[PDB]
Structures are given as structure tokens and as C-alpha cells.
Design a binder for this molecule. Structure first.
Ligand SMILES: [K+]
Ligand SMILES: [K+]
Ligand SMILES: [K+]
Ligand SMILES: [K+]
Ligand SMILES: [K+]
Ligand SMILES: [K+]
Ligand SMILES: [Mg+2]
Ligand SMILES: [Mg+2]
Ligand SMILES: [Mg+2]
Ligand SMILES: [Mg+2]
Ligand SMILES: [Mg+2]
Ligand SMILES: [Mg+2]
Ligand SMILES: [Zn+2]
Ligand SMILES: [Zn+2]
Ligand SMILES: [Zn+2]
Ligand SMILES: [Zn+2]
Ligand SMILES: [Zn+2]
Ligand SMILES: [Zn+2]
Lengths: 311, 321, 311, 321, 311, 321
């Protein structure tokens, strides 16, 4: 008995290979700008641009041609549209709802996953509506999140992804989608979303997010979201939490998603550009997700990877 | 879970092609396919097999030609099965270790021409015996376990000498994986893999194979599942690098228990009769061709790492669309 | 230690045999024609005939004499009786309800399992009522399925078997059976029914059926149907899904059924007729089910097998 | 599950005979039955056993006659228990390996006459010792473990020489399964099975057996269950092909743990006193005869593969209706 | 390594002994006759007598002195008091209710466990009220069982033990006990009660009882009764079902009881009287229960065993 | 379960003494008690131990007198701990195997007088070394593993020669259980049990023991639990018949994991400091005496089969009421 034997030759290695990454596993997050004919580079994320809707529709031709199953939209809210009440979240003319209708019309088979969250619409930037002590009120925030989820479903979104970490929001959003007849709008719960330093570059583009030290607690997060009606559950961030992906997949045997966040992408790309890491690291970082038990991966590398995989 | 309707509606992920693709748990690729091939003596020879429509016995020169195609489609390996001329079949099965045997020649030829292509030889003696039973017989007409194994060792080494990267003892004698592993090791063939036919049942699904090659006390009872786990545990302990379940689809439960219990490289053979019944149904217009991919997907879903299948070329063609 | 020892002799083999198939495991599916004195051979399924009720009652004498515990009825709906609303599903004079009353009268101990499904009664052939996009509406279809299940129970059926793959239908049907006093009508849920090519010959005789790639998902299907009140759960198709039978039996320890579908039967019979497989394959294919954990098997071979087992 | 009344009503499957049959989890067949038989010296001899009503000690000629019936009913095997003439009982138990001993003769006779019928011999020395204890005694009056085993090996080989397909060391010495396995192997008896009496308790349920054959520091404490799993694990490691729990019904929990833990061929002995108490109750009219099948079903339900039972013939008769 | 070592000497055997039977494990079932100064021997159960209440109170002095924790009462209903409606079940002057009040008064620390069942009060002997087909109606029987359970609690019984095998009866009885303020009356559910031949002698003294072949099904029985509020769960019969005791204890880790039924006692006693088994078999049969995972044992041997254990 | 208030009220079983008794999961008996005893040289000698109030060092004659009482109360065994005169303490610890050592004499004396009473000797060398460390020291002042074991083997045999039914290697060297088992076996002492001190921690709870007998690189880190399972697995593999956790109450979790993982005879030592802190609190009137039974119940509840406890006599007295 010697484990080096199946490694000796590529064919044996290929036969015993436990996981394979394909384009079916890739979800491309995209930053969406208001206006027309807008493209902006993000210095903290090389190779990634914020795009106005007209320019998103053009780039999406190639994403659809590459086989990318879905996009996750993250609108870039004009400063003037942020408020205490986060009303723009549910504006039928907000960027996300306009972008959803445009993409659903132009590319009917492309999955659109919208972001249900109040932080892009509050002046203070927090994931909810504040009480008089500056604490994010859970239930009152959920009422706004519910209206937002409904406006996404009305715009045609096949998937709504509540990223807010309010307790009970998955059931509250499900109940509203069910009462309104949006029977088939999927809910992708950000179940175990951690208070992480890896988010730094997304912001350029503790009382509610999880403590990085906690593993068991993630299981209780996901059990609640499945009970409350999530069709998919997600871990965020990604690589730094692969152990959490593995336990969530092993324990619940449900569709499990993972977000390779902006910071993870920045780190990898910076190292690649400096010549410190070979470009093959991209596919390796993506394989790690599959190996850990992810069914799908939100990654800003989705285009580059779909290109390498198509060849 | 406490997943309850209508909060939970399992049809939502199924509503669109994109979400189905995102949640799809298993996918078959060409890296999962092994093509078994019947190899003739001689030159410019092909023969059709009546009970295996579309499958041909091939002389080595013809095998080299088809293999060109198989390599381009990305098939990682072949399992070679010689078709022994009746003259060379003896009482003591010496043609097995003959280094000018079909297997050994076919192996040298493919190893020279396609270096990256895996070759899996058959370590057995039923194809080299007049009597046609799996090993040397005693006077009662019953397979001797250990006498059978002195021959098997010799055949195994002859294959490694030919360049075979994998030998596959299909005989179902006890303790043979260790005996061959020991012989390969001390002879210095430390990188030759052993793919044990661990859970091999006494099945009616083998009918057409006997027609392909010209030919219960050792093979497993179809009723038994736990027994299969004891068989596989002994072969891993004896040094098997990979273990196999045979037949295939009729034993998908075994594949799944064997994978769950050992988390070892696990292989399954879609045998001749499985191929014949699918193909016949496809030819009568009773089933659609997409049944081929479905059958193979089932193996992946059950936990198989690789699949020995006569559909390997068609499946590889279909996967490339 | 040598595992060949208990195989050496038939008596030891018999002692250590882990599973045995008996007639108690066999359910015969039967195709039922309208009219009188009708018998039709099915070319895609040799040895199987569609039968009018009068002829079904005659053949059932031998099925009862052989010990076959139950029949599963599949009516062959006249073209003219198919409609958009699938109303014939719940017709007290439909074939299935007439056939049930006739069999319950003539053979009171023989189990009758009816098929709760809309596909034999829709002009478009889909398992439900369509919305204006051509998608099978879940809840509206369940209302029709409920009326059908009630009409089967009124006809005397001891078991109703919802084959439709609508979410929630098992609980909706249970609730209606319980409210109407049909306290003991069993519900045999088709829990994990896959979108399969093996069904081709039944049709001669994706958004709701399961993807063949998915295993874990089958567990969630069956957990819901048990919670919703199924007395038995079923996997369909059969042989190609024995791994699913095994996991369902191991995980839930509930009465587990499997359908050896028309395609599986065709494949086996064709091969037998061509001389490619020995006839002993029939009992081997049936044993595989038992070994995998099935308690019962719907098989078109039920008659042939009960004959081989009686000897 | 979240199975809740009234959505879930467990009586629905029980409402009709047909649904009960469909969901029935276990079924007893004749393939599960082993008939233990007390074998006399001599010719045209039968003796009734007072504490085992309906069971007869049988000379070999009589055993051959009854076995005709047992074979026709499909009983797969007998467990032979010789009734040693008091003359042949010695200090060093040499009658054990005597090839004209009852067991060895009875075995040759059944193996010649009914070739397909399994014979399971008893490897022990309590029946061949003046003292009546299970093995050679030292001067303190206590069973020597390893000295006992030098005799057992010899008896075991004498049975295999007679044609016994299974030997069953019932002694409860440690390390004896390996010692016998080693001796059978090197003597070339590679297909003789060893059915280890693995979990054998110090039970009051054995009373009548001592009456049948004329006759705590080794047998297990009735209070212990985990201990049984350690006993069985050692016997499998030592080469046992099958393991047994004895007594039976009073230890159904052990049968179930032993099956769940090892997934190995597991046997259980419904001992003399179990038979006597059921039969006596049946004769007094206190229990119905259907108790026989119920008792046997319980073993199957618990996980037993085979059952050593004095009811084997009656049960086989009842199963055929 | 040799397992015979700890067996060599009694002290080691005693140290490693995994289970011990004590009097705390014993519940004595008792047959109660109407009238005064009545004692009747039971030929099918030697050493056991039916007793009128006055004579039960006398014998109970010795049962209490021996440490027997509880009695299970089984009234011997006068023929004239049996009816179609089973009304005597809930009669405040029925034998069981009179016997309960008398024992609760005289021996306040002795546990009384009453039998909630309709079979001793129906003219036909079945465990419920029949419909017009001769089938035991489940829900209607539960209404009578509920009134009976209430009459036991009013008489002072600390434990009511529903032996009837009606689905849902444990929750229905719990709900009624809770609504009436009988907050602490324990419910000992006969969860897995099998249709058994071992009951023959009790009768002297299939559509609702379990099939002896079924194991898994017992787990579903007990899961329902725990969910519905049972404080204790029981397997009946005993020895023939020790595998069921073991799995119930392992799976649920709840207070588990077992009934060594009349037939088991008869068999053992007959054999002892004929000299076929030593008297030590009694303690061995009782130890088997403890070893299998029973917390308590209903046994007619409770007196004899408490005597052997006291010495 | 889906057990929910108010359908489920866990106080109902607690409402009366009878139901509490019926559901009581564990019960302590005298069969669970082992009395450790400090044994003096000489005659008519008793000494009080300041840090162990109520416990006396006893010359063998006095030990024989008290043991009368211990045997009548049903205590199954004693664990002997000699108190070595400072003269007999050497560099190479030879007093260990001296057959006129306290242990060996005390053992012969109890084995003759109370044949049924179990004696568990201490196989160690810290009590026989001038330096006071557990084994022969090298020049760095660190315990040599294997040199220590050559002495231990010799002490072990000397105890078996004295009649000790159990030896208990308390040293915490690796591989010592196998070395002693091997030596006992080949010397013919096949029934001497080995009770391995498997999970023995580097604890502050041992303070008073050192006072009782006059006296981190080997003992386990208190922070570690998984490590304990690896220790116990090696000792079972090496032939231990019983394994022990020490200290006790501060390690009840270890007792529970060790029992759950191996289902082997598992013992726990309520060490000197556990005894001292309870007893002191009882003497100050801070805790009631019933704490003794509570502490012992906890061991049973945790899964201990037997408990080495200085409270053994008081507990046995209390259990008899
Ligand atoms: K995927
Ligand atoms: K693979
Ligand atoms: K069945
Ligand atoms: K069997
Ligand atoms: K108890
Ligand atoms: K103990
Ligand atoms: Mg949450
Ligand atoms: Mg093998
Ligand atoms: Mg469903
Ligand atoms: Mg043993
Ligand atoms: Mg119930
Ligand atoms: Mg150690
Ligand atoms: Zn947010
Ligand atoms: Zn072969
Ligand atoms: Zn349908
Ligand atoms: Zn014996
Ligand atoms: Zn009743
Ligand atoms: Zn020490």
C-alpha cells in the first residue's frame, strides 16, 4: 500500500479526482452604476469595473456566451438617494430594479440574483434602520427588507439574496413572497455571514454579523434559514471560512453557496500582477470551494475562470 | 431541517435551467470513463459481437487506430480483454504469462504509441484454460484458491513488464491482491496500481461477455450487501489502490455503501448485459439515446469515481456537445 | 479468514443470505382500457396488455391466486375525455373509479392503488394545470388532485398514490381524506420521482420532476412527504436509482417502495427474447430492490416472478 | 420525521392484510433454520428426553431416516451433538478425536447420503471428560485455557476429515478460533467454516441439555452486553466465518447489537430450556402453537441470519402451509 | 489479551458487571375482582391470584414492605357490566377506580398505574368501539379512553397507562389531563404493543397491534408518543422483544418500560415446577430486561424477585 | 423527540418517590467500590494521615482486622499502597521485586485469609527510589522510559507470585502494559489482570497522597481530553483488562468519553485530595455527609464500572441502610 501510485500518471490522477469545477458553479457579482455610458475601474479590485445598465447589457453577452449561469447585482447608489428610511431599496426605478427588468428582458435564461439589504441605501451605511441608541432594529428593518424583496420579484428577479443578517428575515420574506403569489422566487440566504476584514474593497466599489471565531453557531444560523424557507444557503466570506462550507454541507445536505469576496479577489489579483503567484491559483482557489462542498460560488473571477474552463 | 411547505417548495430550484445547473449535485465527465476493449490475435481483423450490438473485437493494429479517437475525446484509460485463440488454451493456463500474449503485446503497443493513456490489464485464467473456469481445477471440478494464485502472480508481472500502469485481478480468489502486490513490490514495479474486483457478483448480467471472448462458489450472492463491505475492506487491507463493483447498475446501492464506508477510489463496471439491454432498447426505438448519459450519471451519483463502460466513446462524444 | 468459505456450498450460502424476495413484495401495475372485451398488446413492452375492466377481472383471478398483494391501476384515457381542466380525473364514472369499484367488489382482499395525477387527463399531457406562461401551477393543480384522491377513496381504493411531483400535495390530500372521514386510505407518495428517459414505453401504453444527478435532494423530498402524512414513500424509476432506495431506507426507516418502470421492463424483456440475457435476470433485478432496502416493488414482471417463486 | 397524528396514523398500514404484507419488515424462511440433534451410539435406538418433550436422541441409522424428512422440508443444516457412552469418557478426553466417535461416524454417514445438507460439528470436551467440565482440569478444579485448546484442535481436524462443512467451537476458551483456523489451514481444509460460539452466557436456560446428553469462570455474565461485542470482535479477528449468540430469546438485544456492530453472519441458539418452556406451555394449553413462529420471527427481526432451534422441523412444516 | 481474566473470580466479575437489577425496577401487575373476600387461583399462571379489593389491600402490605415501587391494576369486569359503549371504563364505582381510591388512601407512597383500555368493558372484547363493518374506530374510541383516563386521575392514580394502540391517544389523553388540571398524572404509553400469542394466560385471568416482524415501526410508534406527551414508554411483550427495548432506549434515551406478560410468566413457572429450569431463571429473565435498556419491568414475578433481592 | 411543554412536563416523573425510583438511571452499589489502603511495615502499627482526616496507615496485622469488616460490607477489592521504610529506598529500586516487600507480604496474607477478596497491587518505582521520581533517572534528572520498564516487569511478577489477582501499573511510561502482559503470560500467570492507569493527569489533587506514603513530562496535561482517548486505545491494544482515569471528579468528562468510546471496563480514582476536600468540608459543617454518596453516584453516572475511593467503607455502610 502506497498512495503515490494513483498520482504517478495524469490518467490515474484524472480517474480518482474527487471534485471538478465547471462553469455551472460560477455566479458573477457585478457593480451597477446609475446613468448611461458609465464604466469605472476599481483600484482595490484590478480588472473589475462598475458598469451602467447599458454597458452591463453589452458585457453580459459574453458572460452568457461563456455559460455563466447567473449574476448577483450590487447597485452603486447615488449619495443623494441614501436616507434614514432606506426607501430607495424598494424603489421600482432604483438601479437594481431597472437593471433586473433590463436583463430579464434581454437574456431571459440568465439568472439574476438581487441583493436584499438596506446598507446601500442608508446614509449611515448600517444594514438596517437605527433605534435611538444607534442599534440596528431587527424587525422594523425586516419590514423594509420585505418591501425590497417584493420590488425585486416584481422586476422579474428569479432569486433574492438577503445579505442583512437580521434574525427571522428569511421567513418574513418568504411569507410575503408566498402571499403575493411570487411562488417560485428563490431565496438565497446569506446564513453565515461573518464580521470580516476581507470586505474592504467592496466598500470602495458585530451585533449582527458573526464572530469569525464561531463555527457551531453557523449551523444554528443555517438550520433557521432552511426552516424559514431558503432555497439556498450561503457562507460569506469564502476561503477564510471553507471549514464552515464543509460543515454546513455535511450537516444539512442542502444547496450551499459561498462568496469569494472582494478582498479575496484583490489579494489573489495583486499577487498575480506582482509575479508572486501563478495565474493557476485562480482555478485552485475555486476548486477549493467545490472540494469543501460548495454547489456554487459567487466570484469576481467568474469570467476569467469560465474562459480557462471553456478551453 | 423543519423544512415545510409552503415555506419550502422544492420545485423553485427546478423552475429555470440556471438554478437547476447551480444546484446540480453531480456531473459526469470524460475523466470518469473507462473503455473496455476485446483484443484479437492477428492483423486487419474486426469481428462484430452478436449479443453486443455496435461493439467490435479488434486486432491490435485496429485498436491502435480507434485509440487515436478515444485519446482525442479524452478517455483516460482502456481495460484490455484478450480473445484467446482456442489453441493457446491449456490445462495449466501458461498463455497468461506468455510475453507474446495478446494482452502483453497490445499493452506494449499502446504504451509506446499513446504514453499518457492508461491501460488496465485483466489478471485472470478463465481465458487461458480449456475448461473455462476461473483458475486451475482439482479432480472434483472446483476452483483451487492458492494454486490459481501462483499463476495470477506470474500473469501480473508479465503485464507490468509490458508497461501496464494498472492490473486488475478479476478472479475473486481470496488473498490474491496481497500476493500480487507482494510480487510487484519485490520485483521493483512499485507504481503499478492494483484495481481489485472486490464486490463481483454471480450475475445473469454477464451473458454477452462470454459471447464476446469465446467461453456461485466464488462470486457473490446477489442478495448480499454487507458481505460486499467485508470484501472491499480485505482488498484495501491487502494493498488495492482502487476497488470495483461488478455488475453496475443492478448494484448501485453497493457502489453507494462502498463509497460511503471507505472513501476510497471506487469503480463500477457496466457489464456486457447492461450495455446489450440498453442498446437493444435504443435500436428498437423503445428508449431514447439520452438513457446512455442517464445510466452513467447514476454511477457518479452513487459515488463511483470511474466507470468501465462499452458506451465510453458515445458518452464522450455526447459530453463534448 | 477467507470469504469464499460460506459460498462453497449452497446450504451455507442459503444460511448467510441477507435478503429474500417473496410475493409479498410484488405490486402489479396494470393498464386499463375503457369498453368491454378489449385486450391490446404493447409493442414496447412484450407480454403486457392493456385490458378493459371485464378482462382485468378475469386476469385478476390468477394474480390473486398467485398471492400478489396489490395492483396499481393506470387508466388509458380516451382522447375525447382529456381537457384543459382535467375534470375526468375526478369523474365517478372514469375508468379508474369504475375499475376500483369492480375490483373491490370482486376481490375484497386485493389491494388497489390508484394513480393520483393529472397528466392522463390533460390535452397537453403535463402533470397539472397550466398558467399563461405554460408552467404547471402547483397549488391549483393540487385542488384537482385532491378531488381525484377523494373520488378514488369513494370508489373504495385502499391506497392512493400521488405521482404528480407538486410540492405539498401529500399534506393537502391527507387533510382532505381526513376531513372527509377516509381515515384509513393510505397515501403512497412518489417522493423521489426523477425526470427520466426510462419512462418511454409507459407513454406508448424538469420543473417538477427531479434531476437524475441529485441524491441529497431526494432525502428532503421524502422528509416532507413523511411529515405531511404519507404511509409509504416511493422512488421512481427503479434500478437506475437503487442508491436512492438505499439512502431513503437507511435515513427514514419507513415503508419504502420502488417502481421498476416500463423502460426497465422493456430492456430486460428485449434482451431475454434476443437470447442475450437468461430469464433468471428477472429474479435478480427484483432481488436487487430488496437488497437495496425496498419493502415493495411495482413491477410489470410481478406475475412471471410470482410464478417462479411459487415453484 | 415530524410525523404527527392525525396526518400520520400508523394503523392505516395495518387495516388490511395486503398492506401489512407489503410493509412486513422481516420474514422467517426455512433457510434460517438449523436443527440440533442428539446422536446415540448403536443401532435402532431412540430415547425420549424428559425435560425436552417431543425431542428424541437418535442412533445414526434413525438420524439418516429422519434427515430424509428434514432435507425434503428444506432444512439447510444440522448441528450434531453426540451422546457419549460413559465408558468412553476419560481424563484427557481422547474420544473427541477418535475417528470412530459418534460425531465423526454420523458426519461421514450424512455427508455420503445427503451431500447438500450442512453438518455443523461440536468442538468441545465436556462430553468426553469424566469430570464433565469444559476442558482438561488442573489440580485446583479449574479449566486450563491452552491445554484445553491442544485437544480441541485435534477434534476439529477429525471432524473435517469426516466431511463436516462447519465446525463450531462451543468451549469459550480464548484464542481457540485462531488455533483451529491455523490447524485447518495448514492441514489443507481451507473450506471448513468455523462458527464461533462468541457470546455464550452462564445461563439457567441450559438445564434440559444436560439431561439430553448425560452430564461462570468461562461463560459470560448475563448482566453484560458490551462485553459481548468484545468477544465477537476477537472471534472475527481470529478467523470465524460466523458468530453465535447463546442462549437466544433471553439475549435478543445481544443479537441485535452484534448484527448492528459487525454486519457479519450472525447465529443464535434457542437452547433446550427455551424449547422446553414453550413446548410445556403449548402442552398445558397455556399458549397457542403459533408462539413457535413468533419466537423464531423475533430472531430474524433481531438480525439473526440463522437459528439453531429444536423447533426446526415443526417450524419448517408450518412455513410450508 | 484474554476476556476470561475478569471472569476468573467473583470479585472481578462483580466489578465489571454492567447492569444490576433492583427492586426499584419492579412493577407488580395485579388482577382485581369485584366483591369482598374473593381470591381465585389462575391455572394458566401458577402462584397468581385474582383478588377483591379488601384482599388486595392486605397483600399490598407485604408488597410495600418489600420495596415494590408500584402496582399496575387490571380489573376483572363482571360480565354484566360489559356493553357496546364501554361505559363502565369511566364509572367512578368501577373496580379500577374503587381500587385506586382504596390503595391511594391506605398506602400513599405506593404508585398506582391504571389501565386505560376499552377491551375489559366491551361485550365483543376488542380494544375500542366498533363501526358497522366490525372495525375498531380510532377517534371515537379515544373519546371513551379520555373519560376513562379522567376518572382514573380523579380516583387519585399517579399514572395512567393507555394499552389500547389507538393512534393519537397519548396526545388526546394528555390534552384532557392538562385541561382538567391533572398536571402531574403520568402517562405510561404502551408504544410498541405487538399482536402476540404470549398474551394467552392474561385473557384467562392485527389492525391496531403491531406485527411481530416489525422493528423500525416501533421507533415511529415511540417518537409519536413522546411528542404527544408520554412520560414513559413501554414495549409489550417482553423477552420476545428485547431487541425492541434496546433500540427504543438507544434511540430516544427516555424512561423505557417493558411488560413480561402472562405467557412469559406461565412458560417460566411451568418449566420451574417440572424441574426443567432452576429457579435462578427468574432473576436471569429480569436482568435481561435491564441489560436491554429497560428502566422498569412489569412482571408477575415482582414479589418473588423482590424477596430474592432483599436477601 | 418534539417533546414540548405543556404536553411534556419533566417534573411529572419527579412528583413522587416511586416514579423517581422507577426512572432513576444509575445506582451505586458496593460492587462499584474499591478501597485503597496505605500498608505499613511492622506490627500493631497505625498512623493517622494529617492531610487525609479519618484515614490510617495500617501494618498488615491491622489490615487483616479491618478487612474483616470490609469483606462483610461486601467491598470487592483493595488497592494496596506500601509505605516504604526510607532504608529500603535505593537508586535502582530493587525493593519493588523483593518478595518480603510490604506489598508482597500483605498480598500473601490477604489472599490466604480472605480468598474471595480482590487485591490490586501498585506496579511503580517512585516508592522505592531515593530520588522519589517515577522510574530510574538518567544524568539529566529525567525519567528513562524503557529502563523503568525492566524493573516494573520484575515487580509485576513478584506480585503475581504473591497471589495478586490484579496488577495496576500506575507509572505512565509508554509500552509498559504490553511488556508486563508479555512477562505474565510467558511466566504462566495467564489470569492476572492488568488495570492500566491510562488517563492519569498531572494534577494538584494528589497533594495528600505524598503525605500518606512519605515522598508533567509523563503525566497528562489537564487541558487535554482527546489525548486521553489515544492513551486508553494504546493500553487496550497492549492487553489491559481494565483502564483507569485519575484523578476522578475533576475528570468526569474523561470518564464519560472513555466509556462511550471503548465500552471497556473503566475505573476512576477519587484521589487523596478529592477525599481531603470533601472530608474537611464535612468536618467544618459546610457540607452534609450525603455529598459522599453524591460524589460516588457521579462516577457511576459518568460511566465508571468501579471506583477507587477512600470513602469505600463509609459509602458501603450508608448503602446498607
Ligand atoms: K454546482
Ligand atoms: K472520476
Ligand atoms: K415486503
Ligand atoms: K438466513
Ligand atoms: K429502574
Ligand atoms: K460496577
Ligand atoms: Mg440568521
Ligand atoms: Mg477477496
Ligand atoms: Mg415533494
Ligand atoms: Mg473468545
Ligand atoms: Mg401509537
Ligand atoms: Mg501509556
Ligand atoms: Zn447589509
Ligand atoms: Zn475471471
Ligand atoms: Zn403526472
Ligand atoms: Zn462445551
Ligand atoms: Zn385494549
Ligand atoms: Zn508512580
Amino acid at each position: 500500500t502506497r498512495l503515490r501510485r494513483n498520482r504517478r500518471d495524469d490518467f490515474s490522477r484524472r480517474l480518482v479526482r474527487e471534485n471538478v469545477l465547471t462553469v455551472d458553479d460560477l455566479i458573477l457579482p457585478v457593480f451597477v452604476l446609475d446613468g448611461v455610458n458609465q464604466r469605472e475601474s476599481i483600484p482595490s479590485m484590478p480588472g473589475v469595473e462598475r458598469l451602467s445598465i447599458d454597458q452591463l447589457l453589452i458585457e453580459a453577452e459574453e458572460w452568457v456566451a461563456l455559460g455563466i449561469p447567473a449574476l448577483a447585482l450590487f447597485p452603486v447608489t447615488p449619495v443623494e438617494k441614501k436616507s434614514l428610511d432606506a426607501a430607495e431599496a424598494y424603489n421600482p426605478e432604483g438601479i437594481a430594479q431597472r437593471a433586473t427588468r433590463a436583463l430579464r428582458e434581454r437574456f431571459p435564461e440568465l439568472g439574476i440574483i438581487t441583493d436584499v439589504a438596506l446598507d446601500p441605501f442608508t446614509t449611515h451605511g448600517q444594514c438596517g434602520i437605527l433605534d435611538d441608541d444607534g442599534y440596528v432594529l431587527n424587525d422594523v428593518s425586516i419590514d423594509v427588507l420585505v418591501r425590497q424583496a417584493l420590488s425585486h420579484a416584481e422586476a422579474g428577479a428569479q432569486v433574492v439574496a438577503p445579505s442583512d443578517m437580521m434574525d427571522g428575515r428569511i421567513g418574513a420574506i418568504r411569507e410575503a413572497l408566498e402571499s403575493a403569489g411570487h411562488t417560485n422566487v428563490r431565496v438565497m440566504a446569506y446564513s453565515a455571514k461573518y464580521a470580516s476584514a476581507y470586505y474592504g474593497p467592496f466598500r470602495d466599489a458585530a451585533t449582527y454579523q458573526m464572530d469569525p471565531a464561531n463555527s457551531d453557531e453557523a449551523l444554528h444560523e443555517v438550520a433557521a434559514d432552511l426552516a424559514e424557507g431558503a432555497d439556498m444557503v450561503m457562507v460569506k466570506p469564502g476561503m477564510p471560512y471553507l471549514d464552515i462550507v464543509r460543515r454546513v454541507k455535511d450537516e444539512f445536505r442542502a444547496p450551499t453557496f459561498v462568496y469569494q469576496v472582494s478582498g479575496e479577489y484583490a489579494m489573489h489579483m495583486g499577487a498575480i500582477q506582482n509575479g508572486w503567484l501563478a495565474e493557476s491559483v485562480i482555478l485552485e482557489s475555486l476548486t477549493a470551494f467545490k472540494r469543501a462542498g460548495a454547489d456554487g460560488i459567487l466570484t469576481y473571477f467568474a469570467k476569467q475562470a469560465a474562459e480557462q474552463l471553456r478551453r
